[model samples]
Target: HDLYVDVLDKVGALAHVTSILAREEISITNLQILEAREGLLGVLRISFQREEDRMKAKLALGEEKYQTY
Candidate 1:
């Protein structure tokens, strides 16, 4: 249902991660910023309606070099 990832904590970091999903037409059902600060990688959970999409999202995120969990 979701993919856990560690991403940049700066502004637009999340935006860039989701940008690829949007380009691939992935529908986001849920998003949680589990951990965030000024200069550390943020922890996030991105959920999808379909389980299959969960895997796709990870792969897409991987292509962009996002650290997936």
Candidate 2:
């Protein structure tokens, strides 16, 4: 399964988002960052090895200010 998080375009934002998943013991099978308007916004695409992990990630990130789907 896949999860996506929208974040501001800033240094370390990607790392910060990924760290949340890391802390939850989630493994990313595939990852990509899409930037819009030349870094005005960023969408992080994360693919998980398991569906359960993807669900866990959504819950984890939802607790924070990050907009996850």
Candidate 3:
């Protein structure tokens, strides 16, 4: 399963999501970040092996003000 996360243009946005997955013991199988050339918005493509991990990451990121799709 995969979750797309929208983050602000900041240094720790990727780390923020990864840290949550790490704390939850979820392994990321694939990851990609798409940067917008004109704005403070970046899209993160994150893949996980388990559906549970995807859901956990969604909720975890939600609490931190990140928008998930």
Go through the candidates in order and give the clash count of each.
Answer: 0, 0, 0
Report the C-alpha lDDT of model 3 over 22-46, residue by residue, as the tens digit.
8878877998888867666789899
lDDT of 3 at 38: 62
Q: Model 3 segments beyond 4 Å from truth?
A: 38-40
How well is each residue in 1-69 modelled by candidate 2, as lDDT tens digits? 888888886457778877888898888799888876686578888898899999998898889778888
* lDDT-sorted candidate list, best first: 3, 2, 1
| Of candidates 2 and 1, the better by TM-score | 2
Candidate 1 per-residue C-alpha lDDT over 25-64 given as tens digits, one digit per residue, 9 for 90 to 100: 8888988877655565678799889988898888998988
Better of 2 and 3 by TM-score: 2
How well does candidate 1 match the true structure, expressed as C-alpha RMSD?
1.8
**Candidate 3 — worst ten consecutive residues by lDDT sum?**
6-15
Which residue pairs show collisions in model 3?
Answer: none
In terms of lDDT, model 2 sits at 0.83
Say which candidate scores most in TM-score: 2
What is each predicted model's overall lDDT from 0 to 1? Answer: 0.82, 0.83, 0.83
RMSD of each: 1.8, 1.4, 1.8
Candidate 1, residue 8: the lDDT equals 70
- Roughly what TM-score does model 2 have, to 2 decimal places? 0.86
